[PDB]
Curated annotation (Swiss-Prot), chain B:
Enzyme Commission (EC) number: 7.1.1.2
Substrates-to-products reaction catalysed: a ubiquinone + NADH + 5 H(+)(in) = a ubiquinol + NAD(+) + 4 H(+)(out)
Record-given protein name: NADH-ubiquinone oxidoreductase chain 1
Annotated keywords: Electron transport, Membrane, Mitochondrion, Mitochondrion inner membrane, NAD, Respiratory chain, Translocase, Transmembrane, Transmembrane helix, Transport, Ubiquinone
Main subcellular localisation: mitochondrion
Similarity remark: Belongs to the complex I subunit 1 family.
Species for this entry: Mus musculus
Membrane topology: Multi-pass membrane protein
Cross-referenced Pfam families: NADHdh (PF00146)
Compartments, as annotated in UniProt: Mitochondrion inner membrane
Any GO BP annotation: proton motive force-driven mitochondrial ATP synthesis
Transmembrane segments: 2-22, 70-90, 100-120, 136-156, 171-191, 230-250, 252-272, 292-312
PANTHER family to which the protein is assigned, alphabetical: NADH DEHYDROGENASE SUBUNIT 1, NADH-UBIQUINONE OXIDOREDUCTASE CHAIN 1
InterPro entries noted in UniProt: NADH_UbQ_OxRdtase_su1/FPO (IPR001694), NADH_UbQ_OxRdtase_su1_CS (IPR018086)
Swiss-Prot record, chain E:
Highest classification ranks of the organism: Eukaryota, Metazoa, Chordata, Craniata, Vertebrata
Gene designation per UniProt: Ndufa13
Any GO BP: positive regulation of execution phase of apoptosis
Protein name: NADH dehydrogenase [ubiquinone] 1 alpha subcomplex subunit 13
Keywords, comma-separated and alphabetical: Acetylation, Apoptosis, Electron transport, Membrane, Mitochondrion, Mitochondrion inner membrane, Nucleus, Respiratory chain, Transmembrane, Transmembrane helix, Transport
Membership in a protein family: Belongs to the complex I NDUFA13 subunit family.
Membrane topology: Single-pass membrane protein
Keyword Transferase annotated: no
Function: Accessory subunit of the mitochondrial membrane respiratory chain NADH dehydrogenase (Complex I), that is believed not to be involved in catalysis. Complex I functions in the transfer of electrons from NADH to the respiratory chain. The immediate electron acceptor for the enzyme is believed to be ubiquinone. Involved in the interferon/all-trans-retinoic acid (IFN/RA) induced cell death. This apoptotic activity is inhibited by interaction with viral IRF1. Prevents the transactivation of STAT3 target genes.
Subcellular localization, as worded in the UniProt entry: Mitochondrion inner membrane; Nucleus
From Swiss-Prot, chain F:
Topology relative to the membrane: Multi-pass membrane protein
Keywords, ordered alphabetically: Electron transport, Membrane, Mitochondrion, Mitochondrion inner membrane, NAD, Respiratory chain, Translocase, Transmembrane, Transmembrane helix, Transport, Ubiquinone
InterPro entries named among the record's database cross-references: NADH_UbQ/plastoQ_OxRdtase_su3, NDAH_ubi_oxred_su3_sf
Subunit structure, interactors included: Core subunit of respiratory chain NADH dehydrogenase (Complex I) which is composed of 45 different subunits. Interacts with TMEM186. Interacts with TMEM242.
Record's protein name: NADH-ubiquinone oxidoreductase chain 3
Coarse class of the protein's main subcellular location: mitochondrion
Gene Ontology CC, one term: mitochondrion
Localization of this protein: Mitochondrion inner membrane
Catalytic reaction annotation: a ubiquinone + NADH + 5 H(+)(in) = a ubiquinol + NAD(+) + 4 H(+)(out)
Pfam families, per database record: Oxidored_q4
Origin organism lineage: Eukaryota, Metazoa, Chordata, Craniata, Vertebrata
Biological processes, Gene Ontology terms: aerobic respiration; cellular response to glucocorticoid stimulus; mitochondrial electron transport, NADH to ubiquinone; proton motive force-driven mitochondrial ATP synthesis; response to light intensity; response to oxidative stress
From Swiss-Prot, chain H:
EC number: 7.1.1.2
The organism of origin for this protein: Mus musculus (Mouse)
Assembly notes: Core subunit of respiratory chain NADH dehydrogenase (Complex I) which is composed of 45 different subunits. Interacts with TMEM242.
Origin: domain of life: Eukaryota
Reaction(s) this enzyme catalyzes, per UniProt: a ubiquinone + NADH + 5 H(+)(in) = a ubiquinol + NAD(+) + 4 H(+)(out)
The protein, known as: NADH-ubiquinone oxidoreductase chain 2
Similarity comment: Belongs to the complex I subunit 2 family.
Alphabetically ordered keywords of this record: Electron transport, Membrane, Mitochondrion, Mitochondrion inner membrane, NAD, Respiratory chain, Translocase, Transmembrane, Transmembrane helix, Transport, Ubiquinone
Role description: Core subunit of the mitochondrial membrane respiratory chain NADH dehydrogenase (Complex I) which catalyzes electron transfer from NADH through the respiratory chain, using ubiquinone as an electron acceptor. Essential for the catalytic activity and assembly of complex I.
Membrane topology type: Multi-pass membrane protein
Length: 79, 317, 169, 97, 96, 92, 169, 344, 103
């Protein structure tokens, strides 16, 4: 601890340097948003979404984009 | 029309180069209780043109022991790269917008280290070689942190294109965030232009190395190069970290503020020069490898983490 | 030969309007005309051969054309203002123009009733059923060669043992 | 690429002929050695790019990263030699006969 | 502020990618239609020049598969306007 | 092409100057430290490369692996630096 | 223009011819830099920006700067041998011309050169309507999809430091 | 060596061959080869004697150009088949390059000049690694691609190596170089049967490793790089005289000892495949190898060379013992022949 | 390969990206993906010795999607005649070369 103190006052870059190294190694682990990154980027639609044939055996897939079925990004909205 | 634009970017910049020299010789003056050059022309405005003509007229000297190409390639390369790096800069519209723009600026800067290496080998005198070796080292070292500092920026910009930052900085300068790196970009910009606090490349008291055997026209070309760079790097600070206000309806208030911020930060390295003694060769590298590189590498990781857990991953494009 | 379709076979009307115009109305075209669009697309993907799905494609242009004719009939002025402002921008970014966008979008919710699709709800995969038989053997795959036969049975101690030079083993 | 991949390939062979016939300075070999890595890097990048094979772009760079260190080792040997013999000249390297 | 600004930007990134997603089907119908035309048009000229050729069918897939094959940009414009060819090859890189 | 046009004007402007400039007028300095730096420099320069794609990799769906990878790279090189400091290296 | 890539490729070959004739170490270095730029432009011609520009960053200013650096302290002065630099220059020029006719000869053998087919092959296929198909998206698989490619390289650099310091010591 | 560095290097020298063997993507096989090149160079110059720097600078240039040629083969394949790996279709020249290149890293035949010289300037210890844990890597790459390589070239490199190795060895008196030459020879047999029965290459290697590793730890027990030096073995440590005798005759093909099996089954496999031309000439000059092995036998065991009085002093002091590995690898090597059937 | 520590451990650090038909980023399909599949689902269960004769149709095609040399040839051949014919004044590029432009 004592050295820590002097280190804070002598060679006070490394201290800050390491501190950041860690804080970046922690915040991701503990945060209410970390999960969003993999989603927000997942959602971003870059490649055309090819439509599947309607065997008529699928109640999950929305038959029309504006239908009340399917995925939503309201999480992205009001984020 | 494209040429017209080519002319509009190069000619004005070159003229600005010239007057920076004058401005450097008056702002340093008033800081040191002296008027500076005002007698030639009105208020010294004709002063930059005057020595340009004296420099080109004086006999270019080719040392008995000197390569004749690694000697003439070196100033041509220095002016060519520096004026070239103004090609892809957002003001706000770039002349040649390149999707990987910042990598162009980083790569083109890196090539200038050769000119120093080639000129030092070409001179074939001891002062030149010793100066070049230390110089190349300074420049190269200040490239490793220089590059990492940009990579931290990009990751918060989303792309390598300098044009994107005008849209990233529509609400706040990237100084507020990332100020810790601005400082470290500013100091690295001072090293890479071999300006004062870091002018050991060509220390005068130490080795009166880069232009030892360079006089007249060759002296001028690097010379011109350095000063244009002095501006360019300051201008990159004024786009990457200090984002001038952009209004799509009127594009010139972007350039008007770009004008104001670039001049002030260009004024700052002039002010730094007069204010500080020059660092020692090892004291200079001690800073980058010990003081800055650990700060930069760690803050580099913080800039890969800030995006993810703050769900702020920047939009590509 | 190549059985490339003839020109008369592929001469159909198209929108032929500036990219910006399509872009300005894109959000509503993705809305009013995906039933047929998708179909053409589903035809396109499953039957890799475009030549096979050309017809669906003529339907595509057509559906859109009237989409435009209806716009032409109502809220046309709005749309005209929205596209002109959208076109001026170099990347034709949508946010520079929101005041013009609100008018046309509002109007089409008064005159055409059509609705601007909320953030998303266009990216989501769609189900469209098509008569065209799920092309079997797409890729026109040839027959897969037969797998080498399988030695069968259970191991039994080797016969007469390692048969190496003079090793009774 | 049909004939643009023959120039690069012959570049590699011209660089091959170089590394194999030494002359005086060792640096010229090392330097030559690097000429190949550039030719390999260019050819790998070229075909990956016209095969649209993005899954393979990692390689063009892995090639450079390994080649750089490879060269680092090579130069340290070179510095070691002109510390023991005052020159990089290869003739000096004839003690193991 | 950076967190909020990029989140706004990301939503915008989604709003316009989907805009093309909607516009793509039309482009696909257009591209193919035009692509075939280029192939066919080249067929006309092909026949015109390959007729005299001794026992050389006008056109034949170097590949025996009957699957539909996209033509190389080189095939589409090689015998077309050289300028057209150039535009396709290095046009985007030089942009505009 | 547009770039080619600009660049050749750029070389022309410089060659013009030097030409007028020459026409109008009418042995063993070695320190391993220096070599060592150059080396370190590339080891760092290569790393810069493995770190450059990070802007595109941010948008990668994984994210967790991205950061896990990137953090490992930065940490292992920094340790390289650490040992450079610990050893006489970086002490000129 | 259609030969833009052939030419660049040609100059590259010459550049390498230079390195091969082994001119003075530092001039040879200049040669590798010239070839380097030519090469970068080649990769930047087939559509790859990241791969190319990286060549510049890591290899043009990054790696050879070192070469020139070390070729500054340890490769002596190439003294008393400089004269050949002129002879080498000549053979280079002569060789270049030789090749000039040489490829003309190879062109004769139609049985590749596609003299007429020049500019028809620099690129072969493109996702005309694609968005995320830029060289680099791939280079990033190194962090996620392919990480082995990174864990191996990373080890190299790490071990590299320990190795170089040990050799240098 | 800061023990940390020792670990990093040794790990690399060991991760180097292991990545090569485990991976299938040739690229990853190339970097495995690259890591071995980088890791070995530091150890080679540990004494940092003037001879050493020469050794490493040769080893490195020979290794580096070969590494670049192997990469070119992978780069070319990538354009003749999108795959990153050799296939039935591979152009013949593509494979031949890989043979030459890999035969340079392994140092076979007309590329056998670097090995004897690097084996001469490196310590006895690093000599072993340079001879046996650095041959595993390239051979793995060849053994994997055996179905595709040329029977003609391999045979020529095989026969050449046998001859060069034998002839070279006859004149040499430095032990390090006698071993370097033997390795060239044995390496030759190994590459002879690769096209026909790779599984035997892996036997003719292990046996070579189980023979050479004891032989070198013997040379260094007394750290004798001269035959004259090994000849005074009788005074320095008498017991190893018996096994040094059998291991060296085992390295050559004499029938009661384990060393016959590799030559015997390689000859049986080549005759099964009809090379009764090639196999015969190889076996014959193989007999030349035993002549120089027995000449050493003479000096070290069958005849007692005169020693120095100062040797009595070294006897007094307790002799640091030879590791256990010597024994377990001396016996398993000198006499396992009665158990050949299960080995093959 | 020589030591399959990968299959055993179940890890796939080196196999996912060996062919052009492997998963490309953002599912941007490679070129010749129409064939390599057809040429490796064919040679699966059939060893090489017999992936080299009977599965020759799929490689002869995949050797042409990628190299795309027969095309180059045919095309080059076409041009030559066009050159000679153009010499006699026989061939006159149609304005189709410069016609309207389809959207
Ligand atoms: C320095 C010495 C060397 C120099 C002089 C000698 C030089 C020899 C040079 C040889 C060069 C050629 C190498 C090949 C030799 C022959 C190989 C061979 O026979 O393979 C087939 C053979 C299988 O058939 P087989 O053993 O002949 O059949 C016997 C029956 O099964 C019947 O047997 P079983 O199944 O009933 O076996 C059970 C039997 C124990 O089994 C045996 O020990 C059998 C030993 C003789 C086997 C026959 C070969 C004899 C060759 C002499 O009873 C016991 O279990 C008693 C307790 C265990 C033993 C306790 C005493 C141990 C010390 C005595 O495999 C072996 O012999 C394996 C052992 C290795 C060969 C014998 C030892 C090598 C030669 C002598 C070396 C002495 C050291
Ligand atoms: C010399 C060569 C090298 C040495 C020899 C090496 C020999 C082995 C070589 C191995 C090569 C790679 C092999 C694996 C890749 C290839 C095979 C494959 O397909 O695996 C893919 C697979 C992809 O990642 P993953 O393992 O699936 O990701 C973990 C979860 O699945 C992720 O799913 P998640 O949804 O749970 O996401 C996690 C997230 C989830 O957050 C939430 O969603 C919250 C709501 C849900 C909560 C419940 C779920 C989350 C629970 C917490 C997270 C647990 C999972 C994540 C754990 C991360 C740490 C493992 O929470 C977090 O963000 C945790 C952050 C932890 C940060 C740790 C930072 C360490 C930095 C370095 C420190 C100093 C060292 O494996 C990897 O690629 C990563 C492992 C390999 C890393 C690179 C190689 C390391 C070994 C060499 C080291 C030395 C290098 C020297 C140069
Ligand atoms: C094709 C095969 C051809 C074989 C012959 C040719 C190949 C071998 C040639 C060896 C010599 C080559 C030339 C080298 C130089 C020779 C002249 C010289 O200067 O030697 C110095 C050297 C100086 O040593 P030293 O200063 O006396 O050190 C020992 C101490 O004095 C302390 O000594 P200690 O008096 O305290 O030692 C007492 C110990 C001495 O023990 C030994 O020395 C054992 C040596 C085993 C060697 C195996 C070689 C196998 C080759 C195939 O007594 C025992 O252990 C009794 C058991 C020994 C049995 C050995 C044979 C077993 C064969 C199987 C029998 C049947 C199976 C049932 C066995 C049941 C056993 C209860 O003289 C030796 O000691 C030679 C030792 C090795 C003799 C090997 C005889 C093998 C016969 C076959
Ligand atoms: C990512 C990049 C990370 C950094 C990479 C490089 C790190 C290099 C560290 C080397 C430390 C050992 C060393 O050599 O420096 C000792 C230092 C004096 O350094 P100097 O005078 O420049 O001489 C250097 C050679 N001795 O004198 C010292 O003792 C400096 C001591 C530095 C450590 C002080 C304590 C740091 C940690 C403080 C934590 C505070 C709380 C943080 C909370 C975080 C929460 C997440
Ligand atoms: C003096 C030596 C240094 C010369 C100045 C430094 C030039 C550095 C050029 C770096 C690469 C530039 C680049 O990549 O831009 C490519 C450009 C646009 O491509 P892109 O960004 O991808 O945009 C596509 C969609 N808009 O479009 C292009 O394809 C441009 C192609 C390359 C243009 C190069 C211009 C000439 C530079 C070389 C001059 C050679 C003569 C001097 C040789 C010096 C040798 C030491
Ligand atoms: C080759 C054929 C097989 C070998 C034949 C010669 C065998 C005997 C060799 C004796 C020693 C070498 C000298 C004679 C061979 C020769 O041509 O010179 C190679 C040259 C020697 O360099 P130097 O140190 O000056 O030696 C002069 C000795 N009086 O060293 C060099 O040239 C260094 C540069 C090597 C690459 C140069 C460029 C090669 C490609 C040139 C263009 C293409 C030519 C195609 C033919």
């Amino acid at each position: 601890s004592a050295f820590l103190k002097n280190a804070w006052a002598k060679e006070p870059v490394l201290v800050v340097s390491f501190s950041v190294w860690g804080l970046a190694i922690i915040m991701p682990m503990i945060s209410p948003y970390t999960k969003y990154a993999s989603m927000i980027n997942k959602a971003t639609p870059y490649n055309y979404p090819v439509p599947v044939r309607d065997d008529g055996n699928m109640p999950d897939v929305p038959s029309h984009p504006q239908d009340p079925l399917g995925p939503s990004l309201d999480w992205l909205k009001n984020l | 029309m494209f040429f017209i634009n080519i002319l509009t970017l190069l000619v004005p910049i070159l003229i600005a180069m010239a007057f920076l020299t004058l401005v450097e010789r008056k702002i340093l003056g008033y800081m040191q209780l002296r008027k500076g050059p005002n007698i030639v022309g009105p208020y010294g405005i004709l002063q930059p043109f005057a020595d340009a003509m004296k420099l080109f007229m004086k006999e270019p000297m080719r040392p008995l022991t000197t390569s004749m190409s690694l000697f003439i390639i070196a100033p041509t390369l220095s002016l060519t790269l520096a004026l070239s790096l103004w090609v892809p800069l957002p003001m706000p519209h770039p002349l040649i917008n390149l999707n990987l723009g910042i990598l162009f600026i980083l790569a083109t800067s890196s090539l200038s280290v050769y000119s120093i290496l080639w000129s030092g080998w070409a001179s074939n005198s001891k002062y030149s070689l010793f100066g070049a070796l230390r110089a190349v080292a300074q420049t190269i070292s200040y490239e490793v942190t220089m590059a990492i500092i940009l990579l931290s920026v990009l990751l918060m910009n989303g792309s390598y294109s300098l044009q994107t930052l005008i849209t990233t900085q529509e609400h706040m300068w990237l100084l507020l965030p990332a100020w810790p790196m601005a400082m470290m970009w500013f100091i690295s910009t001072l090293a890479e232009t071999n300006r004062a606090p870091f002018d050991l490349t060509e220390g005068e008291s130490e080795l009166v190395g880069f232009n030892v055997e360079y006089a007249a026209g060759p002296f001028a070309l690097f010379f011109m190069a350095e000063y244009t760079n002095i501006i360019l790097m300051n201008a990159l600070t004024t786009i990457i970290f200090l984002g001038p206000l952009y209004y799509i309806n009127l594009p010139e208030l972007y350039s008007t503020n770009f004008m104001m911020e670039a001049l002030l930060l260009s004024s700052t390295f002039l002010w730094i020069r007069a204010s500080y003694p020059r660092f020692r060769y090892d004291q200079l590298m001690h800073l980058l490898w010990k003081n800055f590189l650990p700060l930069t590498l760690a803050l580099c990781m913080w800039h890969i983490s800030l995006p993810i857990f703050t769900a702020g991953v920047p939009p590509y494009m | 030969i190549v059985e490339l379709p003839t020109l008369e076979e592929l001469k159909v009307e198209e929108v032929k309007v500036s990219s910006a115009v399509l872009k300005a109305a894109a959000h509503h075209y993705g809305a009013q005309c995906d039933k047929t669009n998708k179909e053409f697309m589903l035809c396109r993907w499953e039957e890799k051969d475009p030549r096979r799905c050309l017809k669906e494609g003529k339907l595509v242009n057509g559906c859109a054309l009237n989409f435009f004719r209806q716009i032409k009939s109502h809220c046309a002025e709005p749309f005209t203002e929205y596209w002109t402002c959208l076109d001026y921008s170099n990347m034709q970014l949508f946010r520079h123009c929101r005041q013009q966008q609100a008018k046309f979008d509002q109007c089409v919710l008064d005159k055409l009733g059509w609705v601007r699709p909320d953030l998303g709800q266009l990216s989501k995969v769609t189900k469209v059923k098509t008569d065209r038989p799920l092309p079997e053997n797409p890729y026109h795959s040839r027959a897969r060669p037969e797998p080498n036969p399988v030695i069968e049975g259970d191991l039994k101690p080797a016969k007469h043992g390692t048969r190496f030079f003079f090793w009774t083993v | 690429m049909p004939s643009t991949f023959f120039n690069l390939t012959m570049a590699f062979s011209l660089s091959l002929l170089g590394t194999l016939m030494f002359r005086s300075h060792l640096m010229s070999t090392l330097l030559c050695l690097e000429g190949m890595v550039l030719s390999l890097f260019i050819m790998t990048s070229v075909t990956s790019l016209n095969s649209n094979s993005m899954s393979s772009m990692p390689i063009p760079i892995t090639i450079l990263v390994f080649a750089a260190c490879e060269a680092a080792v090579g130069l340290a040997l070179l510095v070691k030699v002109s510390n023991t013999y005052g020159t990089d000249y290869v003739q000096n390297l004839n003690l193991l006969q | 502020r950076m967190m909020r600004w990029n989140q706004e930007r990301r939503r915008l990134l989604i709003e316009d990618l989907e805009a093309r997603i909607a516009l793509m089907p039309l482009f696909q119908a257009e591209k193919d239609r035009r692509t075939l035309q280029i192939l066919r048009e080249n067929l006309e000229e092909e026949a015109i020049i390959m007729k005299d050729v001794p026992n050389w069918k006008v056109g034949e897939s170097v590949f025996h598969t009957t699957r539909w094959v996209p033509p190389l940009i080189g095939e589409m414009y090689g015998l077309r306007t050289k300028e057209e060819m150039s535009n396709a090859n290095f046009g985007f890189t030089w942009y505009t | 092409m547009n770039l080619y046009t600009v660049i050749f004007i750029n070389i022309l402007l410089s060659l013009t100057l030097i030409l007028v400039a020459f026409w109008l007028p009418q042995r063993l300095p070695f320190s391993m430290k220096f070599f060592l730096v150059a080396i370190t420099f590339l080891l760092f320069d290569l790393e810069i490369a493995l770190l450059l794609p990070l802007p595109w990799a941010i948008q990668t769906i994984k994210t967790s692996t991205m950061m896990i990878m990137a953090f490992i790279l930065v940490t292992i090189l920094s340790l390289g630096l650490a040992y450079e400091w610990t050893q006489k290296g970086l002490e000129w | 223009m259609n030969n833009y890539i052939f030419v660049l490729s040609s100059l590259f070959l010459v550049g390498c011819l230079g390195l091969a004739l082994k001119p003075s170490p530092i001039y040879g270095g200049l040669g590798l830099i010239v070839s380097g730029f030519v090469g970068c432009l080649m990769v930047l011609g087939f559509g790859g920006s990241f791969l190319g520009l990286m060549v510049f960053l890591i290899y043009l200013g990054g790696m050879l700067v070192v070469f020139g650096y070390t070729t500054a302290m340890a490769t002596e002065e190439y003294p008393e041998t400089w004269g050949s630099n002129w002879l080498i220059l000549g053979f280079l020029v002569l060789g270049v011309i030789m090749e000039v006719f040489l490829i003309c000869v190879l062109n004769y053998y139609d049985e590749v050169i596609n003299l007429d087919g020049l500019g028809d092959w620099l690129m072969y296929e493109v996702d005309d309507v694609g968005v995320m198909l830029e060289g680099g998206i791939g280079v990033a698989a190194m962090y996620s999809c392919a990480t082995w490619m990174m864990v191996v390289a990373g080890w190299s650099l790490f071990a590299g430091i320990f190795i170089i310091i040990e050799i240098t010591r | 060596m800061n023990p940390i560095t020792l670990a990093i290097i040794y790990f690399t020298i060991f991760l180097g061959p292991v990545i090569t063997m485990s991976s299938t993507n040739l690229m990853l096989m190339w970097v495995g080869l690259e890591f071995s090149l980088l890791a070995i160079i530091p150890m080679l110059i540990n004494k940092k004697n003037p001879r050493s720097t020469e050794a490493a600078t040769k080893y490195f240039v020979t290794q580096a150009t070969a590494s670049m040629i192997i990469l070119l083969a992978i780069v070319l394949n990538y354009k003749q088949l999108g795959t990153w790996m050799f296939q039935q279709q591979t152009n013949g020249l593509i494979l031949n390059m890989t043979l030459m290149a890999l035969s340079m890293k392994l140092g076979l035949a007309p590329f056998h000049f670097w090995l004897p010289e690097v084996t001469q300037g490196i310590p006895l210890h690093m000599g072993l690694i340079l001879l046996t844990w650095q041959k595993i890597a390239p051979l793995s790459i060849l053994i994997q691609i055996y179905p595709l390589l040329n029977s003609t070239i391999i045979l020529m490199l095989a026969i050449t190596s046998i001859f060069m190795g034998a002839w070279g060895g006859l004149n040499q008196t430095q032990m390090r170089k006698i071993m370097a030459y033997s390795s060239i020879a044995h390496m030759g047999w190994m590459l002879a049967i690769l096209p026909y029965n790779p599984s035997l290459t892996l036997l003719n290697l292990m046996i070579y490793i189980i023979l050479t590793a004891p032989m070198f730890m013997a040379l260094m027990l007394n750290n004798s790089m001269t035959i004259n030096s090994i000849s005074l073995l009788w005074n320095k440590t008498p017991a190893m005289l018996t096994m040094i005798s059998l291991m060296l005759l085992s390295l050559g093909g004499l029938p009661p000892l384990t060393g016959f099996l590799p030559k015997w089954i390689i000859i049986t496999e080549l005759m099964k495949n009809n090379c009764l031309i090639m196999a015969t000439l190889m076996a014959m000059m193989a007999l030349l190898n035993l002549f120089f092995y027995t000449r050493l036998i003479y000096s070290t065991s069958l005849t007692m060379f005169p020693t120095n009085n100062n040797s009595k002093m070294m006897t007094h002091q307790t002799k640091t013992k030879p590791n256990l590995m010597f024994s377990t690898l001396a016996i398993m090597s000198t006499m396992t022949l009665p158990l050949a059937p299960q080995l093959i | 390969p020589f030591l399959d520590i990968q299959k055993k451990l179940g890890i796939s650090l080196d196999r996912h990206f060996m062919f052009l038909s492997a998963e490309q980023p953002y599912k941007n399909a490679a070129r010749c993906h129409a064939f390599e599949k057809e040429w490796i689902e064919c040679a699966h269960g059939i060893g090489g010795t017999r992936a080299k004769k009977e599965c020759k149709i799929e490689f002869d095609d995949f050797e042409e999607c990628l190299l795309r040399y027969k095309t180059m040839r045919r095309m080059h051949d076409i041009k030559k005649q066009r050159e000679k014919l153009m010499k006699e004044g026989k061939y006159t590029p149609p304005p189709h070369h410069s016609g309207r432009e389809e959207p």
